[PDB]
Amino acid sequence: HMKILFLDQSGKPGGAELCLIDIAKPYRDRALVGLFADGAFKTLLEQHHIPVEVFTNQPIFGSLGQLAPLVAKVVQTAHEYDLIYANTQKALVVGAIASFIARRPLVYHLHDILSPEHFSQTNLRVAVNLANRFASLVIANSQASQTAFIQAGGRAELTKVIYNGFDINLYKTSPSDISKLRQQLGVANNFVVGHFSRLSPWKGQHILIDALAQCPPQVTAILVGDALFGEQDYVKELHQQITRLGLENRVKFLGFRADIPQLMAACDLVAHTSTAPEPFGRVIVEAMLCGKPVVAAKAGGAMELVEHGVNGFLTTPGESQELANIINTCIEDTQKTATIASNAQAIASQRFDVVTINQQIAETLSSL
Amino acid sequence: HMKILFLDQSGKPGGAELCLIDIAKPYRDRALVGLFADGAFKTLLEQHHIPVEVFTNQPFGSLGQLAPLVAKVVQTAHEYDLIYANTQKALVVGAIASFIARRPLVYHLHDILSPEHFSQTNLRVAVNLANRFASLVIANSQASQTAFIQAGGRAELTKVIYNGFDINLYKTSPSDISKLRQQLGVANNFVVGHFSRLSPWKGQHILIDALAQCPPQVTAILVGDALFGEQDYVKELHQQITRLGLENRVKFLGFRADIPQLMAACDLVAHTSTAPEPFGRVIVEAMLCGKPVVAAKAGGAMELVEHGVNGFLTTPGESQELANIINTCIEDTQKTATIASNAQAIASQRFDVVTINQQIAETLSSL
Ligand SMILES: O=c1ccn([C@@H]2O[C@H](COP(=O)(O)OP(=O)(O)O)[C@@H](O)[C@H]2O)c(=O)[nH]1
Ligand SMILES: O=c1ccn([C@@H]2O[C@H](COP(=O)(O)OP(=O)(O)O)[C@@H](O)[C@H]2O)c(=O)[nH]1
Ligand SMILES: OC[C@H]1O[C@H](O)[C@H](O)[C@@H](O)[C@@H]1O
Ligand SMILES: OC[C@H]1O[C@H](O)[C@H](O)[C@@H](O)[C@@H]1O
Numbered sequence: 001h002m003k004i005l006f007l008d009q010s011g012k013p014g015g016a017e018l019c020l021i022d023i024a025k026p027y028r029d030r031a032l033v034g035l036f037a038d039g040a041f042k043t044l045l046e047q048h049h050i051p052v053e054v055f056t057n058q059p060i061f062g063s064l065g066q067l068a069p070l071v072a073k074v075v076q077t078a079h080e081y082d083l084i085y086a087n088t089q090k091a092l093v094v095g096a097i098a099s100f101i102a103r104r105p106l107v108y109h110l111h112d113i114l115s116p117e118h119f120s121q122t123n124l125r126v127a128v129n130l131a132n133r134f135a136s137l138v139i140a141n142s143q144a145s146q147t148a149f150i151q152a153g154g155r156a157e158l159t160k161v162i163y164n165g166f167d168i169n170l171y172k173t174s175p176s177d178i179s180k181l182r183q184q185l186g187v188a189n190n191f192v193v194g195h196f197s198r199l200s201p202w203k204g205q206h207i208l209i210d211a212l213a214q215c216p217p218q219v220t221a222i223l224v225g226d227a228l229f230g231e232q233d234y235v236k237e238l239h240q241q242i243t244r245l246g247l248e249n250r251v252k253f254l255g256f257r258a259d260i261p262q263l264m265a266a267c268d269l270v271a272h273t274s275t276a277p278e279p280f281g282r283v284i285v286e287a288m289l290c291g292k293p294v295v296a297a298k299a300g301g302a303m304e305l306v307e308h309g310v311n312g313f314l315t316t317p318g319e320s321q322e323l324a325n326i327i328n329t330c331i332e333d334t335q336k337t338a339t340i341a342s343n344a345q346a347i348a349s350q351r352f353d354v355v356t357i358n359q360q361i362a363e364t365l366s367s368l
Numbered sequence: 369h370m371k372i373l374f375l376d377q378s379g380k381p382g383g384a385e386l387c388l389i390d391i392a393k394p395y396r397d398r399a400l401v402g403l404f405a406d407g408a409f410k411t412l413l414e415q416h417h418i419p420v421e422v423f424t425n426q427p428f429g430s431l432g433q434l435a436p437l438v439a440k441v442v443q444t445a446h447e448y449d450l451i452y453a454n455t456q457k458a459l460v461v462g463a464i465a466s467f468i469a470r471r472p473l474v475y476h477l478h479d480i481l482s483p484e485h486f487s488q489t490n491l492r493v494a495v496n497l498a499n500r501f502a503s504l505v506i507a508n509s510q511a512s513q514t515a516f517i518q519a520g521g522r523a524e525l526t527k528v529i530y531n532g533f534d535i536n537l538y539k540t541s542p543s544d545i546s547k548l549r550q551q552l553g554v555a556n557n558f559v560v561g562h563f564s565r566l567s568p569w570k571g572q573h574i575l576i577d578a579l580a581q582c583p584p585q586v587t588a589i590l591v592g593d594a595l596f597g598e599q600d601y602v603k604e605l606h607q608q609i610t611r612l613g614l615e616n617r618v619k620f621l622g623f624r625a626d627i628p629q630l631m632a633a634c635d636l637v638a639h640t641s642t643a644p645e646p647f648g649r650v651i652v653e654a655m656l657c658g659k660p661v662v663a664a665k666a667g668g669a670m671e672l673v674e675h676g677v678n679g680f681l682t683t684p685g686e687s688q689e690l691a692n693i694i695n696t697c698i699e700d701t702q703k704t705a706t707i708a709s710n711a712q713a714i715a716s717q718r719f720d721v722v723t724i725n726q727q728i729a730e731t732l733s734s735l
Contacts, residue, residue, distance in 0.1 A: 057434075062490040064460060067425075068435045090434060102491055102498075120428045122468060129467075 002365065004031040007074065007079035007091035009106030010229070011039025011054065014198065015282050016111040019141070019164045020087050023109070023361065026049050032081070034074060036090060053077075061101075071097050078102035083365075085109065089127055105368065108135040110159075112280045113148040113300060123329050128153045136368055139361075141280045147235050160364055164282055165357025168349055171289040173265035181266040185252070190220040191331055194267030196260060196283040197274070199227040204273035204297070206241055210320035213245045215327050220249075221271075224263060226256035264290040269330050272296040275318045281305060288312065288348035293341040295326045296301040313346035370732070372399040373448040373471075375441065379407025380593075382565070383649050384478040387508070388454050390532050390721050390734035391476070391728065392418050400448065402441060404457060428468070437463055445469040450732075452476065453502075456494055463497040472735065475502040480515045480646045480667055495520040500504070503735060506728075508647040509668030527731055531647055532724030535716055538656035540632040548633045552619070555586040558698055561634035563650040564641075566594040568601050571640035571664065573608055576685030579602060580612045581693050588638075591630060593623040631657040636697050639663035642684050648672060655679065655715035660708040662693045678711035 004027050021044060024033055028050045028313040035042060038054045045052040047147045065072030071094050071302035078084055078098040084106045092108050099106035108131045114124050129246040131138050131154060138145035138158045182188040193212075197203035205223050212221060220289055227235050242251050259262060260283075264270055271288035272278065275299075277300030284305050287294040298314040306312035315322040330337045372395050381649045389412065392399055396418045403410060413420040421444075423438040432439030438461050445465040453462035454476045466473035475498050481491050495692055498505050498521055505525040507513040511651035513526045549555045560579075564570040571653055572590055579588055594602045609618050624630060627650075630638055639645070643668030651672050654661040662680040663669040673679035680693045697704045717723075 062487040062493070064457060064490060064493060067437070067457060067460060070434065090431060093431060093434060101492070120429060123431065125468070126429065126431060 002027065002083055003029055003081040004083045004085050005078055006031060006033040006085045006087060007036075007095050008033065008037045008041075008087040009090035010088065011035050011041050012105060013039075013041045013044055013125070015280065016087055016109075016165075017041045017044075018282065019111065019230035020109075021045065021048055021050065022165050022167075022358070023085075023087075026174070026358055026362065032077070034077065034091075036094075068357035070094065072164075074098050075101045078104055079171060083107065087111070089123060092127060092130055092135075096130040099134045105136045106134050107365075108138045110138055110140045110145050110149060111279060113145050113277055114154070114275070115148045117276050124152045131155070131158065137364070139364065142302040142304055144277060144304065145279045162360055162364065163352055163357060164280055164285065165354030166285065166289055166352050167354050168289065171261045171264075171286070173262050173290070177262065178265045181262055185222065185266065187220055187222070187252075187266070189218070191218050191269070191327075192267040193219060193221045193269045193271050193327060194224065194264060194287075195263070195271050195273065196222060196224045196286070198225040198256075199234055199238070200231050202274060202276040204275040204318070205238060207273045207275065207318060207320050207323060208245065208271050209238065209241055209245070209251060211323040211327065212247055212250055214321060216331075217250065219327060219331075220265065221251045223251065223253045224255075224257050224260070224262070260286060261290055264292055267292060270294040271323070271327075272302060273317075273323065274299070274302075277317075278302050284312070285348055285352050288341075288344040289352070291341055291345045293330060293337050294344065295323065301312045305348075306344075309340070311340060311347050369398055370450055372450050372452050373441075373445055373450040373451040373463050373465075374399060374401040374454060375402065375404075376409075376454045377404045377457035378455065379405035379409050381407075383414055384454055384476075385409045386412075386649065387478065387531050388476075389413065389416055389418065390534070390725070391452075391454075393708070394725055394729070400444070402444065404437060404461075439460065441465050442468050445471055450474060450735075452720070454478070455472075456490065459494055459497055459502075463501040466501050466548045472503045473501045474732070477505055477507045477512050477516060478646055479514050480509075480644050481519045482515045482644070483523075484643050485612050491519045497527065498522070504731070506619040506731065510671055511644060511666075511668040527732065530719055530724060531649055531652065532721035533652060533656055533706055533719050534721050535656065538628045538653065539545050540629050542556070544629065545632050548629055552585055552589065552734070553634065554589070554633075556585065558585050558636070558694075559634045559637050560586060560588045560636045560694060561631060562588060562638050562640065563591045563593060563631070563653070564592070564639070565592045566602055566605070567598055569643040570640060571642040571684070572605055573657055574640040574642065574685065574687050575638050575689060576605065576608050576612070576614065576618065578690035578694060579614055579617060581688060581691035583698060584617075586694060586698070587617040587619070589619055589620045589621055589630070589634070591624050591627070627653060628657055633661060636694060637661045638690070638694075639669060640682075640684075640690065641666070641669075643667075644684075645669050651679070652715055652719050655711040656719070658708055660697055660704050660714040661711065662690065662697075672715075676707070678707060679715045 005044050033052045035054045055070050055073050061072050074094050075098040079102050083097045086092040087109045140161045146161050150156050272284050274297045280301045280331050284296050295313040296306050297317040308314040313326045401420045403422050423437050423440050427436050428439050441461050442465040446469050451462045451471050453459045456723045495688045507528045517523050562575050580613050637659050639651050639666045647668045651663050663673050664684045665681040675681040
């Protein structure tokens with residue numbers, strides 16, 4: 001049973017970090033998760049009985065540590081573990097360094113699409129070179145990510161695609177609880193479109209909002225998720241968009257919620273609307289596992305998760321009218337829509353069961 | 369005429385840093401010296417009209433949050449043609465900026481990269497970054513070159529280029545000599561001057577042991593600064609001094625800028641490092657002041673001095689062997705003065721800043 005030091009730059013519970021809980025959990029006995037900032041994510045790992053430590057760049061190897069204490073601390077810690085598992089870009093930088101100095105093999109779990117759209121040239125160059133030189137293995141969360149890695153100059157022979165896994169039990173809610181929650185929200189007699197991405201222009205909440213202007217008034221949207229600071233302009237732009245379309249009573253922000261399965265159960269349609277390619281899209285799968293019909297943007301790993309008209313729908317990114325037509329089709333073809341949504345659950349529960357992903361990972365790890 | 373970004377970790381004017389003034393001065397029109405800390409060295413560069421900027425780690429890539437200084441240096445480097453790294457930390461940073469800004473890197477090596485001077489990590493880092501990113505590794509001594517290579521460095525990257533010196537600075541009036549010896553209260557002493565920062569490996573404590581084995585008109589001046597945290601060493605010297613009844617024969621002058629003058633005021637200059645010296649600027653300085661110099665037999669000292677010809681050499685750690693040389697300088701005044709006088713002629717050939725500067729410029733243009 002390996003000793004694994006996991007590293008993640010964020011103290012916040014984003015996709016990558018949510019995914020790491022499931023990645024790490026089977027190793028929680030002899031493992032540790034290193035965060036480069038404190039926040040909600042630490043609590044989760046605590047709540048999941050995973051050892052976590054927050055590293056800082058405060059002072060206290062060699063003298064070179066004064067340049068970057070965080071790195072020195074991590075390098076020091078790395079001596080105690082058999083493996084460095086880096087879950088984000090910054091964690092790859094630090095984990096490369098500590099891989100070399102502490103003489104421990106390094107795994108890069110890639111949750112991003114390394115394209116010019118998504119990141120600066122510099123970030124692409126660094127990640128590719130550090131991975132190519134120091135990573136024993138690059139686990140990609142999707143083929144779209146693997147492909148982007150390769151096109152940015154990454155070494156194909158290092159890559160292995162492994163999708164996110166999910167606890168299937170967590171995705172079932174009582175139909176009373178659904179009635180309760182729809183009530184509490186004041187949407188019980190609406191057609192509820194749920195959007196579950198953190199608030200950020202490229203997640204395209206503003207595309208959905210534009211689409212409501214072409215839907216009948218019983219169609220309402222809940223926007224769930226927070227804004228990561230820097231994107232507070234976007235939060236303004238949404239409310240100014242709503243005001244400008246008279247949608248004040250049809251769009252609700254709940255901010256960041258821990259009760260996503262329940263909320264998905266309370267929706268009628270889950271919508272993924274990213275205007276830039278999505279590496280994976282946890283929400284897409286999550287919807288499918290909650291028996292809900294999902295529409296998604298046709299790019300990135302979304303196209304791997306959904307086939308249009310069989311287990312979900314797919315629309316041109318940034319095209320609100322197209323999204324509207326799907327919402328309206330859902331309203332009418334009740335029988336079809338529910339078939340698609342029930343198939344989606346069956347199919348998705350095969351690919352993405354956390355049990356099958358965890359063994360796909362452990363097999364991958366022990367083979368080096 | 370290339371724009372050069374010189375980098376140096378220190379704000380204090382140590383040996384490598386003083387060396388850098390002479391390295392950089394001919395390029396000051398289009399160059400910049402970036403320091404990772406502020407201090408007197410900045411002032412010096414200002415006084416020599418060499419542009420200088422202090423970088424901090426206060427808040428390219430989002431990655432720059434990991435190490436802001438690195439991000440600033442990387443940014444700055446887009447405006448220059450070459451990056452010239454003069455210390456170990458400056459190599460780390462400069463390697464990173466070399467990659468990201470796609471600018472060639474030169475590493476000026478002033479250390480002896482051996483397990484005695486540095487941690488394994490420090491060796492491994494410098495060698496690996498140098499091997500991978502440096503177009504050229506300029507060593508200050510064959511001793512330094514060798515230790516690089518023995519630690520894994522790439523022989524074919526190395527070129528030994530010795531420190532240079534302005535010859536016009538190393539001359540003093542007999543009258544000025546007398547005043548200074550007077551001010552110091554040593555006019556009828558045999559004066560041994562030790563011109564090194566106060567760290568155990570500079571071996572002031574060895575000279576002190578030697579004094580007790582010297583004739584009684586012999587006194588020492590220790591010229592140099594102590595770091596905070598090597599104050600425990602300074603206390604030991606003072607205790608040692610007292611233990612040997614030498615309170616009135618050893619005086620500390622702290623850091624001083626009038627080095628040529630103070631060397632002139634000495635009768636002997638003594639280099640006593642207990643660990644191999646990469647180069648030893650004070651040894652050459654002494655020779656350029658026409659004084660007899662005794663040095664420790666190790667590192668790049670052995671390249672500067674042949675024992676009995678232009679100076680003396682002694683077994684590191686061995687005080688008694690140092691005494692014999694002092695005694696000898698006292699007894700054979702004419703021999704010594706010839707050795708001392710030869711030393712100046714010999715050293716003024718090799719280490720003339722002019723000839724070293726040419727040596728550097730031909731190395732740099734050939735790229
Ligand atoms: O307010 C929110 C928004 C999202 N999520 C969860 O976090 C994931 C969001 O990650 P996704 O892959 O959708 O986008 P990312 O954040 O990874 O770019 C989803 O699966 C949700 O279950 C959440 O708990 N609260
Ligand atoms: O009190 C002092 C001691 C030294 N120096 C100068 O700093 C250099 C010391 O460098 P050296 O190579 O002797 O020792 P390092 O500190 O470089 O190891 C000499 O050339 C001196 O000119 C000085 O200005 N004041
Ligand atoms: O599984 C990893 C998840 O988070 C990652 O950061 C990606 O951005 C997202 O596409 C994916 O759904
Ligand atoms: O190269 C100039 C000086 O640099 C180094 O720091 C050495 O410690 C010293 O021996 C050398 O003379």
